[PDB]
Structure formats: C-alpha cells, structure tokens
Amino acid sequence: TATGVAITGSAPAASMDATLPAQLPISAASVQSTFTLNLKEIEESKEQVT
Amino acid sequence: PLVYTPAVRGGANPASGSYLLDPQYVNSGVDILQATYGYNINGTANADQLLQRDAILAILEYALKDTAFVNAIQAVAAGSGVTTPASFVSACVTKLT
Amino acid sequence: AKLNLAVLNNVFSELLTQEINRSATFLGLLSKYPERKSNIQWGVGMGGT
C-alpha cells in the first residue's frame, strides 16, 4: 500500500507483497487397458487371414 | 464541537509555514481579497491557540465570502452608537455573547 | 513407502508468476516537470470590455 501522509508527518504502516503455492497432485489414478489373447489364435491367424 | 479543516483543496497544512488563502470575492460582487496566513512565529501554541486559530480561518474562508454574514455585519455598522471603529468591534461582541 | 514417508522435502519450481496490474499508463505521457516552489500561480484572462 502507498497511502498519503503530510510532509512533517510520521512514517506509515508496514506493507509487503505476498506469494501463494499451487500443490496440484499427481499420484491418484492410472488409465489402463487389457486384451488377453490366447496362444493358438496367434498361430492360426497367420494363415487364416489374407 | 467543531470539525474545521483548511478550506483550500490540496494545501491544508503547509510544510513551508505559509498557508496561502485562495482568492475569493467578497461583496458578493466586486472585490477580490487574496490573503495569506503565516503560522507559528512567536512560539507555537498553548492549546487555546489551536482553537482561536480554528475560528480565525473560519471567519476568513467561509464568512466574508458569504452574502448573509456581510449584511449582518452591515446592520451593526448602522447602529446609532457605532462610530470610531474600535466601538464597532466592541458592539458586535455584545451581540456575540 | 514407509521409509521415505516423513523425510520428504518440498522443492518448489522456479515458476513464480505475477498476477497483478501495476500499470501507470496515464502518468507515462503527462510531460513531467520539476517544481521547487510552494504553489504555481498563473493568470487566466476573462474579459469584460
């Protein structure tokens, strides 16, 4: 703050800026997927598919 | 019970010590005034002299500009026992008590 | 992590962002001057002839 005081007056009150944090968490969850293919299907679909 | 402030806008309590009265127009017509006012020159004050000064500037900023105070100080000067104007200033004191 | 559970430290990034409008735009074009005197006195002319 910058207030108005007289010339032959005392000093004003104290004043100083302020800074603030953010904290924004990154450990809660996980986007995932599964598909579970067999072991014969990966062999027979190398000839059955054009 | 009075809350007077010096009536010029940005020059209320000067650090130079010379409070300059703004020019004002006194008969409601025709005359300019142009005063100044020097502060503490033979001491400072004894807490009555902050209050008499509080009314000297009141009778000088607001009263001589006014068009009804000057008519009431005119009607004192038309009294039938008011001559040699040190009896003029003592006849309005008996009014003001 | 029970070991590294209370021996953690906060290591704020170098990303301070200013979020205030301290702009003196009209003061920046008024053609400033010094004045070491009590008060400026100039004279305005009306007329009346």
Question: DSSP assignment of C12-46, as one string?
Answer: --S-----------SGGGS------SS--------
CA dist A2 and A17 (Å) reads 12
CA dist B86 and B91 (Å) reads 9
Q: Where are the strands (E) in chain B, listed by range?
A: 18-19, 37-38
| Cα first-last separation, chain A | 78
Take residue A31 and report the two structure tokens written for it: 């986007």
CA dist B77 and A24 (Å) reads 84
Q: What separation in angstroms does the CA of C6 have from each of A21, A31, B88, B96?
A: 20, 29, 91, 83
Q: Would you say B39 and B49 are in contact if contact means Cβ atoms under 8 Å apart? A: no
- Expressed in Å, this structure's resolution amounts to 3.5
Q: Does C40 touch chain B (CB under 8 A)?
A: no
Cα C4 → chain centroid: 45
CA dist B82 and B71 (Å) reads 16
| Domain positions in chain B | 1-97
Q: How many CA atoms lie within 13 A of A3 on its CB side?
A: 9
Chains touching A (3+ CB pairs < 8 Å):
B
Q: Would you say B13 and B20 are in contact if contact means Cβ atoms under 8 Å apart? A: no
Residue B20: list chain C partners with CB under 8 A. Answer: 38-39
Q: Would you say B23 and C41 are in contact if contact means Cβ atoms under 8 Å apart? A: no
